């Protein structure tokens with residue numbers, strides 16, 4: 001192994017709260033931290049968690065090519081891992097969703113034979129689903145960088161979700177601290193008008209970045225986007241959501257090969273029918289709650305404090321994880337108050353072992369996770 | 377206002393660590409918690425954080441329609457909010473990404489005039505980007521439910537990312553505790569063979585669910601998926617990633633209207649060229665680091681412990697947030713050790729105010745966030 005490592009983590013979109021527990025812990029454990037966040041509470045929070053932090057935001061500048069900024073961000077990180085330190089990069093939202101420097105820095109680090117990992121985080125698209133009450137599954141989701149969408153004239157699906165990032169800097173390769181002059185926005189408004197028509201809805205989406213703020217979820221027509229006062233509101237943290245125009249009919253060849261509207265309807269879709277919550281199926285399913293008992297093959301949790309504790313520290317304590325990863329058996333034996341089954345399950349590391357150790361597994365089942373929460 | 381509320385939060389995919397700080401805090405604050413998670417460490421962790429929890433997983437059953445399960449899950453939650461309690465639903469990953477019961481339960485609750493919110497979380501798609509080292513921006517991302525993809529014969533873009541959820545239960549509307557017999561998987565393998573050809577790569581992706589485990593990132597050909605031993609490995613937590621076959625050429629009409637390969641290349645793309653990290657642009661940008669000083673319009677953090685504290689509790693303490701949301705001024709005045717500017721910025725709640733209170737704003741700038749981290 002070569003000394004030094006790079007881990008890139010996210011903070012989520014909304015200030016502090018949308019940081020994951022493993023992001024925070026890796027930040028605490030890092031030798032050097034490099035961060036690029038928008039809001040200052042998040043920044044100040046980060047600075048309390050590690051002493052050796054560097055704000056990457058200072059490598060932006062007026063008129064300066066973002067590509068140069070990204071090279072610089074990524075070089076600054078890889079330099080400290082060549083020195084043998086464990087360095088953590090931090091980017092708002094999800095650190096790999098519309099982010100050049102993370103992918104760049106990890107790819108460089110792995111080519112030189114350093115351990116490199118990205119930990120996922122809550123993206124602005126994630127926030128979009130939550131705030132606009134839509135699900136990517138229904139009826140599919142297409143996601144593009146607004147400029148890339150235009151330059152490679154990427155195809156659109158009228159019967160699916162369309163999400164467009166960086167609508168506030170169409171064609172702009174550089175930066176400005178007072179914001180962009182998004183003067184080529186009308187080119188995008190032309191493209192959407194072509195594909196969706198002038199009265200198709202467009203949702204201007206900006207997720208709250210502070211806990212007390214409401215998101216922006218404003219609905220305009222495509223034509224409205226050309227109005228100067230409306231386009232003015234589109235900025236650097238603007239995302240567009242373009243709902244489907246219609247529902248696509250089901251294929252009859254396929255339904256037969258497989259031998260075969262869910263509430264609620266997508267409210268942003270223009271001509272949605274009202275969908276009923278309590279149809280007969282729903283009525284019947286609900287009546288069954290009265291006498292409902294857990295199926296035979298259901299596995300109730302049956303664990304101990306010692307076991308839940310050790311499984312928590314493995315997830316929250318990167319040091320504990322490193323010891324366990326180095327030797328399952330030695331680690332297992334040294335953790336106190338474990339039953340022989342708990343201690344055995346840690347020794348294997350097996351998902352099955354750990355489920356059997358932590359759950360009251362029924363005989364039927366004994367002789368593999370299955371939790372599907374969407375149906376089409 | 378009507379008493380009672382519903383908040384749906386996520387736990388992320390990897391056990392405990394991928395839960396966000398605001399998810400955890402709402403779980404702690406809730407009157408009643410209903411959860412649907414895969415792994416038992418996450419479950420046990422949740423049970424330590426609130427006393428009144430109900431496992432929703434017991435409303436699945438062999439042969440039982442998932443739609444009935446989802447109606448039941450959602451009804452159980454809305455029932456407790458009709459009783460006037462503040463109830464939190466918990467679903468693994470992102471609670472609104474391929475999840476019927478969350479959207480269903482919130483839509484019912486809002487139609488009856490109860491406060492209803494979804495908080496986003498780390499999806500399996502989020503984990504995919506991180507583990508497979510890809511970025512949705514480059515070169516766009518299409519995401520479908522595998523059965524929906526077939527039934528509505530949804531169009532594919534050969535020049536973009538394709539992500540397919542629920543590849544392990546093609547056409548299966550029901551549940552089984554010992555896993556699905558995914559016997560109509562060959563229908564999907566036919567569709568992919570049609571659109572991509574028999575030697576196009578397909579990545580079988582399963583994110584580690586436990587901190588010590590490695591993800592599955594196995595690359596098969598489309599033809600290989602028909603081999604019984606290979607299709608056997610596809611399960612309930614399987615996702616497919618289908619890379620682009622080629623790069624789409626740039627539109628010349630559009631580049632002119634806008635008056636106009638980034639390292640690293642997508643390693644899963646079949647015929648990728650090798651991309652250079654240190655081209656001249658990169659060389660030059662890096663040399664500028666030696667004499668680099670923060671631009672004039674850069675705003676260094678300049679805050680106080682009292683201010684960072686209060687901004688942290690607003691994000692981590694839903695009670696503190698509720699008081700602040702009820703009256704900015706009263707709340708601001710009652711928090712100790714705030715400077716007049718800090719205390720004034722809280723009073724307004726304004727993003728600008730709070731940035732000015734927490735950062736040393738340069739004169740130039742004084743007279744609006746802009747943090748774009750991808751370039752095309």
Ligand SMILES: Nc1ncnc2c1ncn2[C@@H]1O[C@H](C[C@@H](N)CC[C@H](N)C(=O)O)[C@@H](O)[C@H]1O
Nearest residue numbers: 093094097098123124165166206207239749750
């Ligand atoms: N608060 C927000 N609301 C909506 N979209 C946002 C927000 N912040 C960032 N974005 C989107 O993300 C783009 C900036 C990206 N370079 C970074 C995205 C970030 N990594 C994420 O996880 O979402 C912006 O142009 C927006 O399209």
Ligand SMILES: Nc1ncnc2c1ncn2[C@@H]1O[C@H](C[C@@H](N)CC[C@H](N)C(=O)O)[C@@H](O)[C@H]1O
Nearest residue numbers: 373374469470473474499500541542582583615
């Ligand atoms: N560990 C995992 N690795 C890869 N994909 C997964 C994993 N767990 C769940 N999934 C995907 O999610 C589907 C189940 C969905 N109903 C729930 C998705 C979940 N809400 C999320 O945020 O990803 C599975 O069929 C997979 O396609």
